[PDB]
Design an enzyme around this catalytic site. Structure first.
Site, PDB file in Angstrom:
ATOM      1  CD  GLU A  18       3.726  43.928 -75.922  1.00  0.00           C
ATOM      2  OE1 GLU A  18       3.160  44.979 -76.281  1.00  0.00           O
ATOM      3  OE2 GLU A  18       4.743  43.481 -76.488  1.00  0.00           O
ATOM      4  CG  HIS A  50      -9.568  40.165 -81.769  1.00  0.00           C
ATOM      5  ND1 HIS A  50      -9.992  40.958 -82.765  1.00  0.00           N
ATOM      6  CD2 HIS A  50      -8.968  41.006 -80.826  1.00  0.00           C
ATOM      7  CE1 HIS A  50      -9.683  42.237 -82.487  1.00  0.00           C
ATOM      8  NE2 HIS A  50      -9.029  42.263 -81.313  1.00  0.00           N
ATOM      9  CD  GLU A  51      -8.442  40.773 -76.905  1.00  0.00           C
ATOM     10  OE1 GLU A  51      -7.291  41.097 -76.544  1.00  0.00           O
ATOM     11  OE2 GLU A  51      -9.310  41.598 -77.249  1.00  0.00           O
ATOM     12  CG  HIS A  63      -4.315  42.288 -79.749  1.00  0.00           C
ATOM     13  ND1 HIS A  63      -4.013  43.055 -80.798  1.00  0.00           N
ATOM     14  CD2 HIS A  63      -5.672  42.458 -79.515  1.00  0.00           C
ATOM     15  CE1 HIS A  63      -5.117  43.674 -81.235  1.00  0.00           C
ATOM     16  NE2 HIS A  63      -6.131  43.328 -80.433  1.00  0.00           N
ATOM     17  CB  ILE A  67       4.852  45.539 -82.264  1.00  0.00           C
ATOM     18  CG1 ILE A  67       3.789  45.336 -83.345  1.00  0.00           C
ATOM     19  CG2 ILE A  67       5.081  47.029 -82.050  1.00  0.00           C
ATOM     20  CD1 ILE A  67       4.131  46.013 -84.660  1.00  0.00           C
ATOM     21  N   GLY A 102       9.306  46.581 -78.360  1.00  0.00           N
ATOM     22  CA  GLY A 102       8.866  47.365 -77.209  1.00  0.00           C
ATOM     23  C   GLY A 102       7.499  46.933 -76.720  1.00  0.00           C
ATOM     24  CD  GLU A 128      -7.121  46.380 -82.061  1.00  0.00           C
ATOM     25  OE1 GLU A 128      -7.698  45.262 -82.067  1.00  0.00           O
ATOM     26  OE2 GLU A 128      -6.429  46.777 -81.100  1.00  0.00           O
TER      27      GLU A 128
HETATM   28 CA    CA Z   1       6.160  44.015 -78.239  1.00  0.00          CA
HETATM   29 ZN    ZN Z   2      -8.062  43.918 -80.639  1.00  0.00          ZN
END
Ligand code: CA
Ligand code: ZN
Length: 391
Positions: free
Chosen positions: A101, A126-127, A130, A138, A140, A160
């Site tokens: 990130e 999938h990636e 994230h 999310i 931060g 996940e």
């Molecule tokens: Ca974040």
């Molecule tokens: Zn993952």
């Protein structure tokens, strides 16, 4: 300088570069990674993105100015050349892929069916989730935000599990993945219960991915309220609220029962599932259609007015973003409103699909960020995204 030596190594193993969305997505790839496959990945990202926003209910970056303002994707030719990423970029290679990130970059590799049960598109999807979670869900940075401080593994099952789940995104829904469902144990007794899943962590191994995936699909199909409440605490950085929600859910015998029932149904339908991948509709050449015409059809299809449509340029094609608002005439509660908007948006997509122009097959759409106006009506932001024309 050492830096010059590293970049030469990068340029050697990742010579090809592809850019999309006015440079907001940059894909660096090995010479053997197919150009057509990379283009398909871009469209795959849009299907996941739109479903993600529908469920998460936010399309505004939680923090402006972060490195994920530009998304960089690194794809190595094969599993063997992926191991060089540790030296070239400095990140762990003990995985199918990884998203960092802090640099808004995710790394992966092309593979044959022999080398992995997951396709590149599957792992890409999938990636990509994230990246979506980091940017819109999310607060931060990974391992640094409040959700990671204290109990570092508190959100791991969901982070996940939902990533696996969102990888099954289509233009209208999130459908089960054969590869994930196949991973579920055939013996009911061997499967994770909710409590076990909800406290899983990376050091536990890789099984919680499959069961976290199953729980996400359970929530989406059978407990949208739990899904909604979970993402709300995340967006609000409400760690205590999340933890209370996890404790309630873990010790709820009805949730565990329904979760186990959902897995049985998933496992029972194993033969009915396929790997959701992008259609050939994205690659086909279509007749040019005006931006004004597209806006008009979409406005009619979605029953919205005064929309704003904007053209964006990618390397081998142009796309458009249509932004609008939709006011729900009757507020009947969060989940009922959610289903109405999800059905309405899907109905719009179907209507456009049934039109003569083949370009409408590339359209993805979402609703997000509900709010009350003066007069207590529910106003939604609405976004439609589609191909404008190939070059
Ligand atoms: Ca974040
Ligand atoms: Zn993952």
């Amino acid at each position: 300088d050492i830096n010059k030596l590293i970049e030469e190594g990068k340029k050697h193993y990742l010579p090809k570069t592809y850019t999309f969305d006015n440079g907001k997505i940059i894909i660096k790839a090995g010479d053997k990674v197919e150009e057509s496959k990379i283009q398909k990945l871009y469209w795959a990202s849009k299907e996941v993105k739109s479903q993600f926003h529908r469920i998460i209910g936010n399309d505004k970056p939680l923090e402006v100015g972060n490195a994920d303002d530009i998304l960089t994707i690194v794809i190595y030719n094969n599993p063997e050349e992926y191991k060089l990423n540790k030296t070239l970029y400095g990140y762990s290679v003990d995985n199918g892929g990884i998203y960092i990130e802090g640099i808004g970059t995710f790394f992966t590799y092309e593979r044959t069916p022999q080398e992995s049960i997951y396709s590149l598109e599957e792992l890409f999807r999938h990636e990509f989730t994230h990246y979506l979670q980091g940017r819109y869900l999310i607060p931060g940075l990974f391992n640094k935000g409040d959700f990671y401080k204290g109990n570092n593994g508190r959100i791991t099952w969901f982070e996940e599990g939902s990533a696996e789940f969102f990888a099954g995104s289509t233009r209208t829904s999130v459908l089960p993945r054969k590869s994930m469902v196949g991973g579920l144990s055939k013996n009911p007794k061997e499967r994770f219960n909710a409590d076990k899943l909800l406290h899983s962590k990376y050091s536990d191994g890789w099984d919680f991915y499959k069961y976290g995936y199953a729980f996400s699909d359970y929530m989406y199909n059978n407990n949208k309220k739990l899904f909604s409440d979970l993402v709300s605490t995340m967006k609000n950085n409400d760690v205590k609220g999340y933890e209370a929600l996890i404790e309630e859910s873990s010790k709820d015998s009805k949730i565990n029962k329904d979760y186990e029932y959902h897995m049985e149904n998933l496992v029972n339908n194993y033969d009915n599932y396929t790997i959701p991948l992008v259609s050939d509709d994205y690659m086909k050449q279509y007749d040019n259609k005006s931006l004004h015409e597209i806006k008009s059809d979409i406005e009619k299809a979605m029953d919205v007015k005064n929309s704003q449509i904007t053209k964006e340029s990618s390397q081998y094609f142009d796309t458009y973003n249509l932004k609008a608002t939709y006011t729900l005439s009757s507020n009947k509660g969060e989940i009922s409103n959610w289903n109405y908007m999800n059905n309405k948006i899907n109905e719009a997509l179907n209507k456009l699909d049934n039109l003569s122009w083949g370009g409408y097959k590339t359209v993805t759409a979402y609703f997000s960020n509900p709010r009350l106006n003066s007069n207590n009506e529910v106003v939604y932001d609405i976004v439609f995204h589609g191909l404008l024309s190939h070059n």
